[PDB]
Amino acid sequence: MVSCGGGRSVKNAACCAWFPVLDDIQANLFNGGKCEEEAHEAVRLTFHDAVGFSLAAQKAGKFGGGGADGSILAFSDIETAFIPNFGLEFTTEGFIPFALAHGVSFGDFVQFAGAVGAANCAGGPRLQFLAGRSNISQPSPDGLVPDPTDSADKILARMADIGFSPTEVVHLLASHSIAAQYEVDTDVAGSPFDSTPSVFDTQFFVESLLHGTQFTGSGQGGEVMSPIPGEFRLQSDFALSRDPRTACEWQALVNNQQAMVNNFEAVMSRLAVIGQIPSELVDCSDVIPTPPLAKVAQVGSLPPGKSMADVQVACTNGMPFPSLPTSPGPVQTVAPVL
Numbered sequence: 361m362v363s364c365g366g367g368r369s370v371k372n373a374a375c376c377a378w379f380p381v382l383d384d385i386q387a388n389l390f391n392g393g394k395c396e397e398e399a400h401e402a403v404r405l406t407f408h409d410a411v412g413f414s415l416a417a418q419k420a421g422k423f424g425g426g427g428a429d430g431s432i433l434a435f436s437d438i439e440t441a442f443i444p445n446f447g448l449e450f451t452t453e454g455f456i457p458f459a460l461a462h463g464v465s466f467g468d469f470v471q472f473a474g475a476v477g478a479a480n481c482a483g484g485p486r487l488q489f490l491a492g493r494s495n496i497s498q499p500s501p502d503g504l505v506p507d508p509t510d511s512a513d514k515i516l517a518r519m520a521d522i523g524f525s526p527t528e529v530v531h532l533l534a535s536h537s538i539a540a541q542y543e544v545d546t547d548v549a550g551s552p553f554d555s556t557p558s559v560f561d562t563q564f565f566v567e568s569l570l571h572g573t574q575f576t577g578s579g580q581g582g583e584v585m586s587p588i589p590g591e592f593r594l595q596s597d598f599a600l601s602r603d604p605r606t607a608c609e610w611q612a613l614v615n616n617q618q619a620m621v622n623n624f625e626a627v628m629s630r631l632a633v634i635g636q637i638p639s640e641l642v643d644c645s646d647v648i649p650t651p652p653l654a655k656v657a658q659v660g661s662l663p664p665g666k667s668m669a670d671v672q673v674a675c676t677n678g679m680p681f682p683s684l685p686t687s688p689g690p691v692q693t694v695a696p697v698l
């Protein structure tokens with residue numbers, strides 16, 4: 361190892377340059393190292409950046425997008441006008457000055473910010489962070505970002521088209537354990553996808569499998585019924601939790617928080633280098649912070665007022681759910697991330 365000063369160490373000396381970026385964003389973008397709206401947006405941005413890539417396009421002799429290349433920032437004017445990217449201009453205009461201030465590529469900044477963001481959440485992962493992506497990019501083609509109204513067929517096809525199996529899609533969706541909607545229905549902006557959007561835990565997997573009982577929003581734009589007031593459910597998460605191709609992996613995560621973390625780290629390592637050549641990158645993973653000391657449950661809980669009878673069993677070849685514990689107390693509305 362070498363030292364960067366002040367007791368901070370890295371394997372690769374060039375990585376020391378990322379500590380001033382760390383300090384700036386933890387203080388001035390993430391509100392002192394929190395896992396709240398900006399951290400969630402940073403995680404979401406890694407995917408909106410990387411998903412602008414198409415193996416099929418490449419096979420047809422067309423440009424499919426340069427993947428995890430910072431194009432969502434370099435060409436925010438273009439990409440934020442894509443339908444599934446609506447409203448992302450608040451995020452891209454917020455993020456851009458940090459990349460520019462520190463002289464790092466947009467492509468590295470997007471991956472660095474999502475790694476740091478996720479690492480702020482209790483229970484959270486420590487994503488691999490490789491640096492070195494060119495600052496020269498081209499805009500993503502339109503039509504490549506999944507939409508929450510898309511069927512499981514269409515989403516799984518789009519994801520296979522950037523290199524991910526349906527099992528890996530479920531692993532990537534561990535991100536919706538730290539997540540809310542702002543644009544599907546602005547009337548209920550901040551309504552999260554699980555009861556714990558600051559905790560990287562298995563509650564998204566448990567709660568998405570419950571029967572829907574009420575709408576949080578107006579039921580437009582891909583919202584379907586969720587199982588707790590204040591919690592928002594996407595049609596796409598409903599479809600993937602219950603599709604034969606994905607359901608058994610979805611179920612297998614409800615009682616293994618650590619495997620959810622490990623699997624998320626594994627798939628995000630791939631996501632962050634889509635369109636990139638890893639041998640051209642430098643490993644700066646040791647700049648990424650450790651998550652808060654916090655004991656996150658390894659096994660998820662049914663929310664208050666729910667029993668095992670409320671859980672949809674969609675996995676066939678695998679096998680039954682364990683009696684998951686039930687959280688104590690009354691039914692309570694999930695607070696929005698505002």
Ligand code: HEM
Nearest residue numbers: 400401403404407507508532535539540541542543544596
């Ligand atoms: C598989 C297809 C996916 C669909 C259809 C989908 C859909 C969405 C939608 C509709 C939102 C709310 C956007 C808004 O109105 O504010 C959202 C939020 C979010 N998504 Fe996904 N998503 C997908 C995959 C992913 C992936 C692969 C990741 C990252 C690994 C991700 C990370 C997030 C995060 C962290 C948020 C919360 C952002 C915030 O709270 O500010 N999603 N997703």
Ligand SMILES: [Ca+2]
Nearest residue numbers: 409412427431
């Ligand atoms: Ca991109």
Ligand SMILES: [Ca+2]
Nearest residue numbers: 537556559561
């Ligand atoms: Ca959660």
Ligand SMILES: [Cl-]
Nearest residue numbers: 374377491492
């Ligand atoms: Cl670098």
Ligand code: NA
Nearest residue numbers: 488625626629
């Ligand atoms: Na790894």
